[PDB]
C-alpha cells in the first residue's frame, strides 16, 4: 500500500491549491513535477526496468484518489496510463528495453494527439506519408490533445497517405514533444477539466523514425478486429474514465459533508435543531453515498478482471467483450451518479454554498459535466442494450 | 398584449449582452434604467394612480420572459413586484395615494433588505428602537438584500428593541436608499444570479419616520397567523420564484437547441448523419420540452387564482392555504425541471459545448442552482404532502 | 355543473363495486346501463337534437372523474367520445340528422373495431369488397375492440379490396353490433383495464350500406394529411387517454392516503409516533400530489384549447400541430406520473398493503401499466422533441 | 461450481411451472422437496458435520439464481439461511454438533415465527413463561412466518413473561413445527411472494425444552447493543434480501428480452423495421442491464466480506457497522433497480405483454413490490446518510 499512500499524500497537497489553480487554467507544471517526483508514473513498469512493478488495481485506485482532489490532475495521470497501456501493448522488446528505463530516469509524463476536430469523430485528416529508410512524415492538426503541454513524449496517430504499401492505415508513434515541427497551440479554455491542456496540436513536416513506430502501419486495426491482446486498450481506458467520475463523486460528497457539518444552518422553521439531523439532508447524503458504495465496489471487481486479462497471453473475444460490457456498465452508472450528485448536493448545503462563488463547489459539476461528454453515454447504453437483448458484443474500436 | 411585447423586446436586448455583463457581476445600471423607461415597473399600480392597471398573469409572464434572457434582471424585476405586493398589502390607502403616483413619476425600482445571516432564518438581529415621535431607529446589518443597489426605495424589516409596547415585534418600512445611515455594501460575488446585488446593507442609526411604516409592529405576524389577505404575500412571491425557474428553463432549452442545430456533430460511429435526427438527442429535447409545456400551462392557472384573490377585500385561511399549496406544487415541479434540464442538456449538445468555456451555457445551471436554494424544496414537498395526507395547510410564514 | 355532478355520482357508485367486478373481467353491463340512464353519453349532441349541448372540458372532466373510480368504465366512457368525435368529424348532414336523435332516444353507447394483430400496426387486412348499389362486404378479424360488447353501434375500419374505384382505401362505417356476420369473440383477459371488452371481433361477410359509411373511401387519409378539421381527432383522443391517466393517478393517491391514515404503522425503530407524521411518508405524498396538481391544471388549459379549435371552421397546421404537441406533452407527463405513483405509493403504506392481496391497490398500477402502452410514449417524446428542436409538427395519423 | 450447477438446474425446473403454481398460492411442497433432495440446504454446514462446507458467496449466488426463476422459492431458500445463520451465531457447539448432522440426515428446511401484527414492529406480545425445570411455555400469535408450512423446525422468538428474573427479555428457540400447541394458520394471501407461506402461527401452551433454547434470555439484545459477532445476523439477512431483488431483476430482464426478440412488433409509424433494433427499446435494456451489472459486481464484494467476518472468532462494532453500511447500500440500489425495471420493461415489450394476462410478466413486479416493503428503504437510506455525514454506524437491531 506504499504507492497508494504516495497517491493519497499527493492528493492532499493538490487539494490545498486546486481552487485557485483551476480558475487560471493553463498548465499545472508544479503539480506535474510533483507527480514526476512521486514515481507513480512508473507504476506499471517492471522493477527490473526500474519501475514499481505494480498492478492495474493500484493504478485505478490512485487515479480515483487524485481525481477526488483535482480532476484535471486525475485526468492527466489517468490518460498517462491510457497512453502507457497503448505503448505497452504494441512496443517491441527493443523499445521496452530502451524506453522504460528512460521513462524512469527522465520521469516521462505522457501526452497524446489522437482525436481531430473534423465533421465527425471518424473523419481523420492527419496524414503519415512515407519517407526513405522507413520513416514517415506527419502533417495536420489534432484536437483534444490531453497532457500535450509539458509532455515528455506524445503518443500520436495518423493515417498513411501516398503510401505504396497501402493508404488509410493507422500508424501510431511515440515521439519527443520537442521534435521539430510539433506545435502545441495552448488553446484549451474549458468549462471544467481546465488544467488538462486538451487543446490542439499542429504537425508540420514532423519526422517519425522506424524505431518510434508502435507496430507496423495498420497493426492496431488488425489487433482490434482480431481481438488480439491490444484490444484490451479500450476497456482499460474507459475504466480509467470511470474512476475519474467516481473520484470526482467521492470528492464532491466529502466536501459537501464537511460543509454541512461545519456551516449549514438548520431549517428551524421546520423545527430542525441541527442541519446534520435534518431528515431530508440525511436522505440526500444517504442516497448518493449508497450508490457510490455500490459503484466503487463494482469498480474494484472490474479492475481485478482487467489485471487478470492483462496477464493472459491471449484474451478471447468473449472475455474481451464481457469485460467491455462490465466497463461500459460501470461508466454508465458512474456518469449518471456524478452528474446528479455534483448538482443536487447543493440542496443539502443550502443557499450560502452558492452565494459565495469563492467556495468553489461548482468545480466538481463543471469537471464532471465536461469530461462525461468525452463519448456519448447514450451509445454506451445502446452497446450494453445491444449486448443484453441481441447477444452482440460491442465492436472493438477506439471507443468500444 | 402591449406590456408583454414591451417585456419581450427588453428581453431581446438583454440577451445580447448578458454573457459579458454577468461575468463582471456588479450592478446592471443601464438595464435597470431600460426597465425604468419601459413603464413595466408600474404594471400593478392602478390606472387611476398613473400605473398600467395590469394583472398578475401579465406580471408573471413578463417575469418569465425577462428571466429567460437574463436571470439576474428577471430576479430584480420579479422581486420588485414582491416588494410592491408587500407595500400594497400593508400600506394605508393614504400612503398609497402618495407613494404610487410618486413611484410612477420617479420611475421607482424597489429593493429589499429583510433577511440576515445568523444561526438560522427568522433569527433577526437588525433592531428597531422606538423614538418619542413614533419613528424608529434601525441598527444592524441585513444579508441577501436583493436589488439593494440603485434602488429608489428599500423595503426594510426590523424587530423592536427597548420597546415598552413589546420587544421582538416585526416592523416594516419603505425608505429611500440614501437615508442617512444606510450603507449598501456591494458585497455580492455569487455562483449565479451574479447581477442581483444581493449583498448586505448596514443600518447605522437609520431613522424611519411614521409615515414610512407599513402597518403596526407585529401586524405581519398577526396576518400570517390569521391566514388573512396580507398573508398572500408568500404565495405571490413563491410564484414569482417559480416563474424565474420556468423562464430559465425555457431560455436554456432554446439556447441548447440553437447549438444543436448549428454545431453538434453527428455520432457517425452509430450511423447517424445529423445530430438533429439522433434519437437520443431528440428524446432529451422531447422529455424536457414536454415537462416545460405542462409546467407552464399549470402555472398560468395558478397565476389567474393569484389575481382573483388579489382583488378580494377579504381572504380566508382556506383560500390562502389552497393557493399556497398550488404555488408550492408549481415551484416543486419547476425546481426539479430547471435543475435537471440545465445540466443534462449538455448531453444533447456534445463535448464541444463544454470544451469552449466562452459558449457560456453553464450560466443557466449556475443561475438556477443558486436561486432554487432560496428556501429548501424539501420542505415545499413536505408542505404539499402534509396538506394532501393530513388536510393541513402550510403554516403561513415568510417562506410558506 | 349538472353534468359533472351526475358524473361524480356515477363514479361514487362505481367505487363501491369495482374491486369485485374487475376481478371477473367481462362486460360491466349494469354499469354501462347506469351510464345510459345518466344521459352523459349525449354530452356533445346539441340540445336541439335532444343531447346536452355540453363542451369538451366537461367531457374530459367527467372522463377523469369516472376513471378515478373505475378505470375500465372511464376508458369505455372516454372511447365512446373518441368514436363520437370521429363520427361527427366525417358524417354527412343527413347522417347527423338521423343518427343523433336516434342515439339520444336509444341511449347509444358506442364501441369500435379498428386495430389488428398483424406484423405491425400499419398492417391492415380486414377488407371492404364492393357489393351492389354502393355497399361493401367486410371480412377479417379486428383486435383491441374496446367497448365491442353490449355496443349499440360499432365504429369499424377496413381497407378496400377488389374495388374498381381504388384498392387500399380506408373506409369507416357505423354499424349495428348484431348485424349478421359480426362475431364479438369475448376473448379479452387482460392485466388491467379488465372490463373494457377490448377483445377481438370477427367479420364474416358483413354488409355495410352507403348510409352507414363515414365519408368516402380514403377520405380520412386526405383529411389527416391535409390538416383539415378531422385532423383534430387524434389530439382529442390522445387527450382522452391523458385524462384516464390523471384520473387513475388521483384515485390511487386518494386511496393510498386513506390507507396511510387508517392502517399504516409508525416506524418506531426510528422514533416515529405516527405514520402520517413520518418525513419520508410525507415526502412521497408531497412529490406525487405536487406533480398531479401541475399536470391537472395543465390538462385543463389544453382541454379548453380543444374546445376552441373544435368550434373553428378551419384549423391551420400550426394550430393543430401546436395542440397535438401540447396534448402529447400532457400525455407524457401523465404517463410517467401515473406509472411511478401507482408503484411507489406502496412505500408510503407499508408491507401489509401488499401482503393482503384483497386490499387490491395493485389495480391502479395494473390499469395504468396496461393502458399507457396503447401507443409508445417513447415516440410521443420523440414527436415533442422533433417539434422543439427541428420545428417539425407531428405528421397527422391515428397515433399522432 | 458444483453447488451453483445444482442451483441452476433447480431454477430451470422451477421456471417451467412457476406461472401456474404461484397463481394458486399455498405451499410449493414438490419444489421444497426438490430443494431437500438437492442437498443445498446444507451449504453452510461443515463437511465434518455432513454438510457441503460452502461459503456465503455461493449461498448468495444460489439465492439469486433460484429467485430469478421463482421468487417465492428463492425467498424460502434464502430465509432458511437467515434462520440457519441465527442458529449458528447463538447455539452452543454441543447443540450444533447434534443439530447439524440431524439437519443433514433429515433434510431440514427451516421456517421462522418472529414478527407480529401489533401497533408497531417493536411491540412484541408472544410470551415465554419460565417453567421450573428450565423449560418455557410459548403463547401468542406470530405474523409473516415465512416457510412455516412444511417446516422441519421453526425458529421462534418470544419475550419472557411471569419471569422473576426479568420480563420482556427476548428468547429464541428451534422447535419442531408439529409440537403440541403449534398451529400454522395458512392465511397467507398476498400480492406477490405468493408461495412463501408467510401467514400467521398461533402458539397455545407450547413447550420449549432447555436444549432447544438459543443462548440466554436477552442475549440477542446484549449482542446487538455491543455490536458483537452475533449482530452479523442483520447484515447477513439484509444481504439475502438484496440478492432476492437482484435475482428478480435479472429474471425479469431475461424474460422481457425473450418477449422482445420473439413477439414485439416494430413501430413502423416511425420507420422501425425490427423491434430489437429500436433505439428506445435498446436504451431500456441497456440502462437496466448496466445498473444490474454494477450492482451484481458490488454485491459479490460484500458477500466476500460477509464470509470473512463469518469466519472470525470475534467481530468489532466497527467491522459490523462498516459491513451493515455496505449491505444497506447494496439493498437500496437493488430495491430501486428491481422496482423500476419490473414496471418499465413493459415499455420495451409493448401493449400485448399486458393485454394478455396469461403472459404473467407482472409476477416480477408483484414479487418485488411485495418483498421490498419488508422494512422501509427510506430508513436504510437514512442509515447510510447518518453514517456518511455524521460517522454514526447503524444501531444494530433486527432491521439495521
Ligand atoms: C439569489 C438569492 C437571492 C436572495 N434574495 C433575498 C432577498 O431579496 N430578500 C431576502 O430576505 N432573502 C433573500 N435571499 C435569502 C433566502 O431567503 C434565505 O434567507 C437564505 O438563502 C438561506 O441561507 P442558507 O440556505 O445557506 O442557510 C436570497 C437568496 C439567494 C440565494
Ligand atoms: C476533457 C476532455 C478531454 C479529452 N481528451 C482526449 C484525449 O486526450 N485524446 C483524444 O483522442 N480525445 C480526447 N477527447 C475527445 C473525445 O474523445 C471526443 O473527440 C470529443 O468529446 C467529441 O466532441 P463532440 O461531442 O462535441 O463531437 C477529450 C474530450 C474531453 C471533453
Ligand atoms: C413477503 C414478506 C415476507 C416476510 N417474512 C418475514 C419473516 O419470515 N420473518 C419475520 O420476522 N418478518 C417477515 N416479514 C415482515 C417484516 O419483518 C415486517 O414486520 C413487515 O414487513 C412490516 O409490515 P408494515 O410495513 O405493514 O408495517 C415479511 C414481510 C414480507 C412482506
Ligand atoms: C387497454 C387497451 C385498449 C385498446 N383499445 C383500442 C381500441 O379501442 N381501438 C384500437 O384501434 N386500438 C386499441 N388499442 C390498441 C392500440 O391501438 C395498439 O394497437 C396496441 O396497443 C399495440 O400493441 P403492441 O404494442 O403489443 O404491438 C388498445 C390497447 C390497449 C392496451
Amino acid at each position: 500500500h506504499r504507492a497508494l499512500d504516495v497517491a493519497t499524500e499527493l492528493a492532499k497537497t493538490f487539494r490545498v491549491t486546486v481552487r485557485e489553480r483551476e480558475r487560471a487554467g493553463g498548465t499545472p507544471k508544479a503539480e506535474r513535477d510533483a507527480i514526476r517526483r512521486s514515481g507513480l508514473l512508473t507504476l506499471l513498469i517492471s522493477k527490473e526496468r526500474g519501475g514499481l512493478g505494480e498492478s492495474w488495481p493500484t493504478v485505478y485506485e490512485a487515479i480515483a484518489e487524485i481525481a477526488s482532489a483535482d480532476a484535471s490532475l486525475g485526468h492527466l495521470f489517468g490518460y498517462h496510463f491510457s497512453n502507457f497501456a497503448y505503448v505497452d501493448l504494441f512496443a517491441s522488446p527493443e523499445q521496452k528495453a530502451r524506453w522504460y528505463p528512460q521513462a524512469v530516469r527522465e520521469r516521462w509524463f505522457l501526452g497524446n494527439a489522437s482525436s481531430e476536430n473534423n465533421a465527425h469523430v471518424l473523419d481523420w485528416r492527419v496524414t503519415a506519408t512515407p519517407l526513405p529508410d522507413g520513416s514517415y512524415e506527419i502533417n495536420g492538426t489534432k484536437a483534444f490533445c490531453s497532457g500535450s503541454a509539458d509532455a515528455d513524449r506524445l503518443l500520436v496517430f495518423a493515417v498513411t497517405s501516398r503510401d505504396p504499401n497501402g493508404d488509410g492505415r493507422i500508424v501510431a508513434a511515440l515521439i519527443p514533444s520537442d521534435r521539430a515541427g510539433v506545435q502545441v497551440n495552448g488553446d484549451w479554455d474549458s468549462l471544467g477539466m481546465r488544467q488538462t491542456d486538451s487543446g490542439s496540436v499542429t504537425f508540420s513536416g514532423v519526422v517519425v523514425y522506424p524505431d518510434e513506430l508502435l507496430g507496423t502501419p495498420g497493426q492496431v486495426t488488425d489487433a482490434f478486429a482480431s481481438g488480439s491482446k491490444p484490444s484490451l486498450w479500450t476497456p482499460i481506458t474507459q475504466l480509467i474514465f470511470t474512476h475519474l467520475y467516481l473520484g470526482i463523486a467521492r470528492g464532491a460528497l466529502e466536501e459537501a459533508a464537511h460543509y454541512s457539518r461545519s456551516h449549514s444552518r438548520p431549517f428551524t422553521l421546520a423545527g430542525v435543531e441541527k442541519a446534520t439531523e435534518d431528515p431530508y439532508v440525511l436522505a440526500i447524503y444517504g442516497e448518493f453515498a449508497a450508490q457510490l458504495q455500490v459503484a466503487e465496489a463494482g469498480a474494484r471487481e472490474v479492475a481485478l478482471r482487467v489485471q487478470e486479462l492483462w496477464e493472459r497471453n491471449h484474451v478471447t473475444p468473449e472475455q474481451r467483450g464481457q469485460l467491455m460490457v462490465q466497463v461500459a456498465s460501470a461508466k454508465i452508472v458512474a456518469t449518471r451518479l456524478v452528474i446528479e450528485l455534483t448538482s443536487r448536493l447543493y440542496e443539502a448545503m443550502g443557499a450560502r454554498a452558492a452565494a459565495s462563488r469563492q467556495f468553489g463547489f461548482d468545480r466538481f459539476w463543471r469537471d464532471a459535466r465536461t469530461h462525461t461528454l468525452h463519448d456519448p453515454v447514450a451509445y454506451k447504453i445502446r452497446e450494453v442494450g445491444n449486448w443484453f437483448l441481441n447477444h452482440r458484443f460491442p465492436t472493438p474500436s477506439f471507443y468500444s
Side-chain angles (χ1 to χ4, degrees), chain A residues 3-122 124 126-132 134-272 274-400:
Chain A
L4 293 175
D5 294 331
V6 170
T8 293
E9 286 309 308
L10 278 174
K12 291 187 188 176
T13 297
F14 297 160
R15 269 182 206 100
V16 172
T17 57
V18 59
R19 188 146 38 197
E20 299 75 19
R21 290 187 285 103
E22 80 90 37
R23 294 202 265 260
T27 307
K29 172 56 166 161
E31 290 67 33
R32 296 175 54 89
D33 283 355
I35 292 167
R36 290 185 171 95
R37 291 191 294 276
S38 76
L40 296 182
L41 295 172
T42 74
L43 271 163
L44 296 176
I45 292 172
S46 66
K47 290 180 179 200
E48 291 69 25
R49 284 161 179 151
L52 300 177
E54 262 287 0
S55 69
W56 277 108
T58 302
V59 167
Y60 285 115
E61 222 85 64
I63 289 167
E65 180 62 31
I66 295 174
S68 80
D70 180 323
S72 284
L73 287 170
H75 170 97
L76 291 166
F77 187 77
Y79 240 117
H80 166 87
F81 286 100
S82 174
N83 299 336
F84 181 81
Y86 192 95
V87 168
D88 193 62
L89 290 161
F90 286 99
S92 67
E94 187 179 4
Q95 277 160 334
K96 299 190 184 192
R98 167 191 316 143
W99 288 346
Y100 290 10
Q102 192 174 356
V104 168
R105 256 175 104 158
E106 293 175 1
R107 317 193 306 186
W108 284 5
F109 204 147
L110 305 174
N112 78 100
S114 318
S115 297
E116 304 186 15
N117 188 40
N118 303 312
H120 53 82
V121 285
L122 267 40
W124 269 13
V126 176
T127 56
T129 55
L131 293 170
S135 290
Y136 280 89
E137 182 182 290
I138 311 305
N139 290 288
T141 293
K142 292 291 188 180
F144 286 103
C145 297
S146 285
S148 54
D150 184 51
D152 302 287
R153 292 289 185 281
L154 293 175
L155 170 64
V156 183
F157 294 85
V159 175
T160 56
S161 170
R162 297 183 153 90
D163 190 342
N165 284 297
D167 288 346
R169 296 182 297 162
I170 299 177
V171 29
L174 190 70
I175 64 159
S177 58
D178 61 356
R179 157 93 22 99
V182 176
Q183 182 59 61
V184 183
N185 295 323
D187 50 352
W188 184 239
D189 186 12
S190 55
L191 170 68
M193 293 294 188
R194 285 182 52 73
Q195 292 203 291
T196 60
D197 295 296
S198 301
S200 67
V201 173
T202 300
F203 294 85
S204 313
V206 171
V207 180
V208 172
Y209 300 94
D211 64 9
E212 294 165 341
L213 290 172
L214 295 164
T216 58
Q219 187 177 332
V220 62
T221 298
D222 184 35
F224 285 20
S226 304
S228 313
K229 190 88 164 311
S231 69
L232 292 176
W233 177 87
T234 310
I236 286 174
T237 298
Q238 293 282 328
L239 193 59
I240 286 169
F241 301 157
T242 302
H243 281 79
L244 299 178
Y245 305 155
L246 299 178
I248 296 169
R250 173 160 288 275
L253 208 47
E254 292 173 348
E255 172 81 353
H258 181 78
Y259 183 100
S260 291
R261 286 190 296 265
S262 68
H263 293 124
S264 293
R265 295 176 292 195
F267 193 60
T268 50
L269 208 105
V272 179
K274 323 178 181 187
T276 58
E277 310 298 326
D278 182 274
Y280 305 127
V281 171
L282 287 165
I284 287 173
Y285 282 107
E287 196 104 47
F288 289 120
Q291 300 175 50
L292 177 65
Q293 300 317 293
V294 177
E296 288 181 329
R300 284 187 294 270
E301 175 184 274
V302 179
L304 289 169
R305 181 61 168 177
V306 169
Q307 186 59 33
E308 185 172 26
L309 298 186
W310 182 256
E311 296 169 346
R312 304 276 179 85
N313 281 320
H314 174 65
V315 182
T316 69
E318 220 228 294
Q319 293 169 331
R320 189 277 186 189
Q322 289 183 342
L323 176 64
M324 186 68 242
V325 169
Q326 294 300 312
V327 169
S329 292
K331 194 197 182 192
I332 290 162
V333 170
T335 293
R336 304 307 200 178
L337 174 59
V338 72
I339 293 289
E340 175 151 46
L341 175 160
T342 57
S343 171
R344 296 243 288 119
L345 273 171
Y346 277 94
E347 302 166 34
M349 291 184 288
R352 281 174 304 158
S356 299
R357 181 190 49 77
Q358 196 182 69
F359 177 46
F361 187 86
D362 62 303
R363 178 178 55 89
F364 296 104
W365 175 83
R366 290 190 284 103
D367 294 335
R369 178 70 288 176
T370 300
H371 199 292
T372 51
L373 304 167
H374 183 282
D375 53 90
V377 73
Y379 285 96
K380 290 279 162 284
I381 288 163
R382 192 191 187 282
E383 287 156 6
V384 176
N386 200 33
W387 161 76
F388 190 86
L389 176 59
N390 298 315
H391 309 313
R392 287 190 238 267
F393 287 121
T395 291
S397 73
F398 286 117
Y399 312 80
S400 66

